[PDB]
Amino acid sequence: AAGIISLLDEDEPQLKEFALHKLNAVVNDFWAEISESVDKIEVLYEDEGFRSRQFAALVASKVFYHLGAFEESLNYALGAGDLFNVNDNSEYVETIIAKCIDHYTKQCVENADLPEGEKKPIDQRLEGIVNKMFQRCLDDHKYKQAIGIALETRRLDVFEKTILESNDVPGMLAYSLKLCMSLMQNKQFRNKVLRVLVKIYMNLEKPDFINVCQCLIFLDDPQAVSDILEKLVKEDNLLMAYQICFDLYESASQQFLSSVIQNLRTDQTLKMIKILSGEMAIELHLQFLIRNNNTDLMILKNTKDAVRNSVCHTATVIANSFMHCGTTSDQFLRDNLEWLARATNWAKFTATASLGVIHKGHEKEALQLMATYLPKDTSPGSAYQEGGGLYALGLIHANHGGDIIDYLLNQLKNASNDIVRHGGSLGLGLAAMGTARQDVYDLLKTNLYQDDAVTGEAAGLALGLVMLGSKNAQAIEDMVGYAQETQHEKILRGLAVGIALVMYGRMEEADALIESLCRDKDPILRRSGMYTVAMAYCGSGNNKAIRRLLHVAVSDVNDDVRRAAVESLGFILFRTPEQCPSVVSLLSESYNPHVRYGAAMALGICCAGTGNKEAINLLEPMTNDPVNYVRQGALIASALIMIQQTEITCPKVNQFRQLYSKVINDKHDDVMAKFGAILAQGILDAGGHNVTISLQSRTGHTHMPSVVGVLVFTQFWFWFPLSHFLSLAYTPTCVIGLNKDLKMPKVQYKSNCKPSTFAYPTAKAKKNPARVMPAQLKVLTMPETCRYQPFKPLSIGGIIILK
Amino acid sequence: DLYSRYKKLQQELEFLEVQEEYIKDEQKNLKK
């Protein structure tokens, strides 16, 4: 090879061309020669006189194959000048260009996250070759690959033009945004990509309202949904109009539905307002529920004869509440008037709250219905029932706005400050959840500032509830300041969850508040901070949140803080249940009983109702822990997990069922231990095997009511009356179908599967909505044999209208 | 759809490493 160096020592442009010929002819057959001549070639690198000056960079790139320095190849390509693009493919040129492309994508993301501009552009040839390879992909018609490069390129232009890869718009072109939702987290990038893709979609011939709802539900464009609804109204296709209305109503948060309704308001308009109005969907849902019930008295009798004459009275009443949640069938309790006549004046408050819960959704007649058991009518001397009446009234209109809010406001205004105001304020706050109205905020703050303990905790819970995810700095500063300012635990314990619920759904946005609460000395303030972390990062796998939470659980001495932390961990990872058991496994076996209890609760909440077949697997051994605390934790977790399941779907359901019975039958068991068993039974069979728990909407929008309910339940370890809040987290799996405004349809979908699961106390099925589960819903067959057919598929249940 | 496979693989990797560091810290603490 010595000729190479010897010739290079000579100075002549023709000599340079000869060096070019020989070296590009032999790149690796002789490598140390060029490896040492790197000096000569790099000094020639920068020389305008050199005719083949770009060929110096060409040499660098080509014959630094042994030199693994990536940046070396990067600069070699940058200076390559012309040959970089030409080298579409070869032995190793393809590798170096691919490496350059990935590095260019890295630089693009790095400088694009920089949002204020003044981003140092990369060498032009790099994006030139990037676009050339994009063109090669277009030729190969690999739409998925092209879009993946576009997003990793962090450039929405390529993302937009990728739709020209095949120009058919069957799927990905109009439906890969779902894949993007699944596998990305950058909210800033999220909004821009979402708006771009929805623009692409409505640019299509038919603006499919299903994909148009993305703006409203993910990008929160209430004005946009209002405008498209106005376009539909002037276009006179009421079918699609109320279809999208119901879709958003069941898959959207009221906070902006209010603005949508305002825009719509300022016939077809009246019908639109009604459907985007006080929950005629709820009315028909409750009609569906009463029309179909499967409840067993024998369970109530088995509880009754197993009466313990102890606290589990409250557990029994709440279990019966869960049994017929919203069924308005108290005869199971009306038959015997002693279960509610053998309790301390305090538990009876919970009993009347349960009575209210059983009666959920009537709204219109709720006034007179509650007056029927009115505190003055029932027991004027029992102010506990006085407060329970207002609590029940508030529970009835859960998230259901109306004059009940103002009525409860007035009642609280004219009433005792402490003895009764607890339940009344709590119910008023619940009924005005997220309404953000100042007329209720003022009353709540006054109540908080009435330096009272018995009712102040409920006042603070309501205060947090009303300002749901508002991020209103005024409220958060007020509440945090008042928290450290008082000298009561109950007040502070309530204010903890109140703060946590104040601001949420912001991922890593309220980190200042998170850190402030985390560093606070008070253990209960730390618990409040952990709950705030959970609620803010709800339904996401933010690694920072997981790391902070796990470190807290490992370190913090106060077992309560650790338990709250593990509960939060369960909360934030529900969208990916498969992974939750893996992390919870180690926690399952720890020295600290509280750690194990919180781990069990976290598993239960994370897996929700779907049975991973490993959650129960871990719970079973955990279902025999010596500590009673762990005993009820495991019972409740198993009950929550197994809800709605069947024997065939989960072989273990029988065991726990039987197990539950025995733990409510044996007498030697700890009373506090059994206190969870009755609630476990009630949850497992809650709502006549119709209601269901699910924090994610079928459209992917997270169910705020479910999250709030589960959080309050988790908080119910420090207070019993709070259990009723699980009523909010109950969405039955019934599939609702209606052709016209009220035209009930005679459709009977053929499940084309063995009933088995359906008949929970010949492949086919018939039915209006029925107790059909998401797993069975996905298998249902749409009966085209009838004249009218559904507008949208029946892949999954919900309210699918027909034509 | 190799893009999705790569994305989910990366998610699994990050989750695994965070779990690992947590376990290390927990064992360290339990020693005391």
Return the C-alpha torsion angle A107, A109, A114, A118, nearest 10: 40
The type of residue at A777 is L
Q: Do A579 and B8 touch (CB under 8 A)?
A: no
Whether residue A686 contacts residue A322, with contact meaning beta carbons closer than 8 Å, is answered with yes
Cα–Cα distance for residue pair A479/A470, rounded to 1 Å = 14
- Using a CB-CB cut-off of 8 Å, the residues of chain A touching B3 are 144-145, 147-148
d(CA A559, nearest CA chain B) in Å = 15
Residue of B nearest to A583 (CA): B19
Who contacts A49 (Cβ-Cβ below 8 Å, separation ≥6)?
A: none
Instruction: Give Cα separations from A558 to A44, A543, A626, A718 (angstroms).
Output: 69, 24, 21, 15
Helix (H) or strand (E) holding A179: helix A177-182
Q: Do B18 and A147 touch (CB under 8 A)?
A: no
Cα–Cα distance for residue pair A513/A164, rounded to 1 Å = 46
Interface mutation target, options A554, A578, A592, chain B, most CBs of B under 10 Å? A554
Whether residue A745 contacts residue A787, with contact meaning beta carbons closer than 8 Å, is answered with no
Q: Do A144 and B11 touch (CB under 8 A)?
A: no
Distance, C-alpha B29 to centroid of its chain: 19
Within 10 A of A589 (CB to CB), how many other CB atoms are there?
Answer: 12
Residue burial A459-497, b: 16+ Cβ < 10 Å; e: rest: bbbbbbbbbbbbbeeebbebbbebbeeeeeebbbbbbbb
Of A148, A184, A550, the CB nearest to B22: A550
d(CA A550, nearest CA chain B) in Å = 6
Of B3, B14, B18, the CB nearest to A144: B3
Whether residue A325 contacts residue A319, with contact meaning beta carbons closer than 8 Å, is answered with no
Please tell me the experimental approach by which this structure was elucidated: cryo-EM
Closest CA to A93 of A64, A54, A130, A122: A64
Cα–Cα distance for residue pair A286/A732, rounded to 1 Å = 10
Instruction: Read off the tokens for A46.
Output: 């920068």
Whether residue A791 contacts residue A801, with contact meaning beta carbons closer than 8 Å, is answered with yes
Closest CA to A733 of A759, A770, A684: A770
Residue of A nearest to B26 (CA): A554
Residue of B nearest to A172 (CA): B1
Instruction: Read off the tokens for A593.
Output: 């009983």
- Using a CB-CB cut-off of 8 Å, the residues of chain A touching B19 are 582-583
- Using a CB-CB cut-off of 8 Å, the residues of chain B touching A183 are 4, 7-8, 11
Pairing of strands A736-738, A799-801: parallel
Who contacts A184 (Cβ-Cβ below 8 Å, separation ≥6)?
A: A151, A190, B7
Length of chain A: 803
Instruction: Give Cα separations from A690 to A292, A359, A398, A686 (angstroms).
Output: 9, 16, 19, 8
Residue for token pair 């019993």: A720
Q: Is residue A167 less than 8 Å (CB to CB) from chain B?
A: no
